[PDB]
């Protein structure tokens, strides 16, 4: 095999994978922190929720998650708030 | 995207073409959307062409993009002209 | 648009919010031409399970509910 386009596509795939997984890892940390603050009604619930909604919509713009998935996470967070 | 192109319908060294609106990914002689007209380039002298007007202007407004020679065929009927008039 | 409607008979009401509706129709034989009765069982949703076994009811299709149900109960007209 090893068509020149294919050999390059491997390099740009891992490059995109490294950037992608870091971003959703940061998102999922924010989402978990946001909903755990809401559950015990901590004083920092509001900006953690805003931090989670910010990161969720930033990744949905990067096609990391689908747009419709962002709304389910967003709708879940603000409803519990 | 959506392309207005020609489909080969001829035998060996006697090609006949239909003017067909089809997707770009579809095979040349395969799946289509609508037939618009015909194109015979091997007729007596001038290549006889037949084109419909209502559907041809309907697909052009919908974003269909003619190929290089369908553009010529639509020009010889003034279709590209009337498409241009309605800015 | 319009979703299809069937009228059948309740043959099972042992599950909550779910009844089985027997819609019997007719299918002719391709070769001999005789009309043969055949029946089809439909599993329908009814949040307030007012249908009881033996009632002729009105059934209309909907989006998939559970693994098998695709119908809702529209109208109950019999008493039995």
């Amino acid at each position: 095999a090893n068509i020149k386009s294919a050999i390059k596509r491997v390099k740009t795939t891992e490059k995109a994978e490294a950037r992608n997984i870091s971003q959703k890892s940061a998102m999922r940390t924010a989402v978990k922190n946001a909903k755990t603050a809401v559950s015990n009604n901590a004083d920092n619930k509001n900006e953690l929720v805003s931090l989670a909604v910010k990161l969720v919509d930033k990744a949905a713009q990067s096609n990391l998650i689908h747009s419709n998935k962002a709304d389910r996470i967003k709708s879940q967070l603000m409803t519990a708030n | 995207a959506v392309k207005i192109r020609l489909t080969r319908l001829g035998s060996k060294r006697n090609p006949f073409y239909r003017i067909v609106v089809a997707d770009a990914r579809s095979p040349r002689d395969g799946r289509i959307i609508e037939q618009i007209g015909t194109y015979n380039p091997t007729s007596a002298n001038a290549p006889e062409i037949k084109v419909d007007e209502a559907l041809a202007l309907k697909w052009l407004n919908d974003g269909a993009k003619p190929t290089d020679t369908v553009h010529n065929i639509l020009s010889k009927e003034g279709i590209m002209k009337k498409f241009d008039e309605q800015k | 648009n319009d979703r299809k409607v069937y009228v059948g008979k309740v043959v099972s009401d042992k599950m909550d919010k779910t009844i089985t509706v027997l819609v019997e129709t007719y299918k002719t034989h391709k070769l001999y031409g005789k009309r043969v009765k055949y029946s089809k069982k439909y599993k329908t949703h009814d949040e307030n399970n007012s249908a009881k076994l033996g009632d002729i009811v009105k059934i209309q299709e909907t989006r998939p509910l559970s693994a098998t149900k695709r119908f809702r109960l529209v109208e109950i007209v019999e008493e039995s």
């Binding site: - | - | 034989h29 070769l31 001999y32 005789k34 043969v36």
Partner: protein, 135 residues
């Protein structure tokens, strides 16, 4: 029967058992399995060449050959013509068609084919019995 009896029990036609079964079966040496092929002809190896006595009404010494085909099937085949050059370990081409007298011979060896010569003195009917155009 009545129409209702026909609806419940649709008419069942008889199956057709075909002659020359050994031409309808192939072999797969990789999977050690028998297949269905419907071959016009099959090629085999002569494991025995001899002569068979015919049915009671007739009387003539008829030449035959025990042939193991491309399949793992061992059949008996007739040898049309006058002279034949086949002994053991002879590759032959076998077609259909049985011999009425000979009981147990349901095939014919094609003359003028792979490792099977034609009839030496045949001059009319050379399509059958092999042999090329004299002069």
């Amino acid at each position: 029967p009545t129409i209702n009896q026909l609806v419940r029990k649709p008419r069942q036609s008889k199956i057709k058992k075909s002659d020359s079964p050994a031409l309808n079966k192939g072999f797969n040496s990789k999977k050690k399995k028998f297949t269905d092929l419907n071959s016009p002809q099959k090629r085999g190896v002569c494991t025995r060449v001899g002569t068979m006595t015919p049915k009671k009404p007739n009387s003539a010494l008829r030449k035959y050959a025990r042939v193991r085909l491309s399949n793992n099937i061992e059949i008996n085949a007739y040898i049309p013509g006058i002279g034949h050059n086949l002994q053991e370990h002879s590759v032959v081409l076998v077609r259909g068609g049985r011999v009425k007298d000979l009981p147990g011979v349901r095939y014919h060896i094609v003359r003028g084919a792979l490792d099977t010569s034609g009839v030496d003195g045949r001059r009319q009917g050379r399509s059958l019995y092999g042999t090329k155009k004299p002069k």
